[PDB]
């Protein structure tokens, strides 16, 4: 298991989903983790959900690290500048930056062409999914490149290999996920002279809070949903991609990944971690070799 | 090779005041097309670019070249104006054969060789909005008319090929993200258009002798090789009309669907279709950049134009 004691991490967009679980797994490895998001105990966010950023910070501490909640709208440069100033003030360093901010799960429309998709929702989802990462990198990378060994993880949906041959959901969704892949390549070029590393990371099919609610199940009985969604047998908990980030952050030779697109399932094979249940789902190979091949849902050999 | 015959075709070049946009519109007009040309700069008000070329002037050049240019001043960041533009084309023509998403507007906003934390942030966010959202809004409102019958063509204008950009960081963070998003737009739109018999490609010019570029170098088109002492690798450059002829060749290709989803360059298409630049040459910018300039060889256009 990675030892991240003494490390300073920041997960931008950590209220729920992968962001929360990445922050928690970094804390479970001993890191101090700044966690940002809009939903507080006082105010709900555009998502209109009940998970709060303060709750994430407490879960990071409970897990064995230190969670510091900083409510932040990552579309507001002044707030992200203050966030960078705070980390410098309190810690003088930043080892790991995870640009997780997405916020578009309610805005994209599946199987609508660009002229059928609601336009305002599509433009909004691209701004949330792209500009937040640009703003975060703009203000937080100076601290990260102050000394060698920094790591940036850009969070997307899909690998370069999968997305390179698959249209992803609809026009706006697809442009975001492929821009975040490009961000990993671009930041790898900018960080390498400083001894910094950038990767783009995707989870598999995540059993997020939002996903489990849609399926009407809890984590403890998630396989109850398999009659309704048989290919959900490849799914993983959000902690799996969290352990992938922790494994990268703990890798003394993480620069071997610079610029690459990686997946949680690929990194589980590489580093040997498992999901909470001991399995190692390999979503993107499963999607190609089983589901898109027309075969019946069957997880054998893929987790 | 003989010039494409686009008589009877309806085209729209979004962002056609100057540069590639103007030249694409004029070369479509020279092939006989009716061309709607849009942009913010009019004879009464200058645009964010603060330049003197106007969208009315482009429309007149389209007509002079042998087509019909219809200027529609439009801010492509304003959905209501782009909706009206689409309604107008439907009203006047009932069809749209060729859509060229040329809108860039970022030439003065990107910063060469600044890291993302050094680049001015507001300018970076602005050029991404101008370079990406304008294309999304344009496709959203104009593609319904285009897919009404088979044979429509959409050209997404970017900088670089998929092959070149896949292995090259392009200028700086924000610039790079735009050019690579527009590459992805061609792939995405090809998927959405194919069931309708529509085709999408992403096209890049080479090193263009645009109005802005020639001013930066202190030369006119008639004596552009005067700049070679200061910028030797400018020997690979092409006029904006070259990429205009590339669009006209795609628009005239009965089998243009063979390109669906692909990234293409003006130099690649000149070899494919046989057109030339105005001076009779066929510059091959992206092969030259890799095989001559980046290999450390002295500037020498032999074999590349
Ligand atoms: N169900 C899923 O979430 C799911 C499933 C499969 C794959 N993925 C992919 O995995 C990646 C990570 O997604 P995720 O699960 O972490 O998605 P997410 O929950 O949409 O994003 C993480 C958090 O970022 C915060 N955020 C959004 N906009 C913000 C802003 N302007 N300022 C500050 N914070 C903001 C949101 O919390 P606040 O509302 O509190 O700000 C949000 O809950 C995404 O690329 C996604 O496509 C997600
Ligand atoms: N050597 C080169 O210059 C070169 C080389 C390779 C690739 N490329 C690429 O080729 C592509 C096309 O280039 P270009 O020369 O046509 O660039 P451009 O002149 O920046 O774009 C064409 C016109 O679009 C208009 N426009 C911008 N924003 C607008 C908005 N919000 N609403 C309406 N119209 C708007 C502008 O006219 P108004 O100001 O009147 O609106 C602009 O002059 C660009 O992506 C460029 O990067 C260029």
Numbering used by the authors:
A (entry chain E): 9 to 311
B (entry chain A): 7 to 311
From the paper:
We further obtained the structure of NapW·NADP+ binary complex by co-crystallizing NapW, NADP(H) and compound 1 or 2. The surface of this complex reveals the adenine terminus of NADP+ is deeply buried inside NapW and the nicotinamide moiety which delivers hydrogen to substrate locates in a wide pocket on the surface. We mutated several polar residues around the nicotinamide moiety to alanine and found only mutant D165A showed obviously decreased catalytic activity. The result indicated that Asp165 may participate in the catalytic process. To better investigate the substrate binding mechanism and the role of Asp165, we constructed the tertiary complex model of NapW·NADPH·1 by molecular docking and carried out molecular dynamics (MD) simulation experiments. We found that Asp165 could form a hydrogen bond with the C-7 hydroxy of 1 to stabilize the substrate and facilitate the dehydration process. Next, we investigated the catalytic mechanism of NapW with the quantum mechanical/molecular mechanical (QM/MM) method. It was proposed that Asp165 could facilitate the transfer of proton from the carboxyl to the C-7 hydroxy, resulting in dehydration to form the electrophilic iminium species 1′, and then the hydride delivery from NADPH to 1′ could generate the product 2.
These results strongly demonstrate that NapW and homW functionally catalyze the reductive inactivation of the highly reactive iminium species, which implied that the two SDR proteins may participate in self-protection from endogenous DNA alkylation.
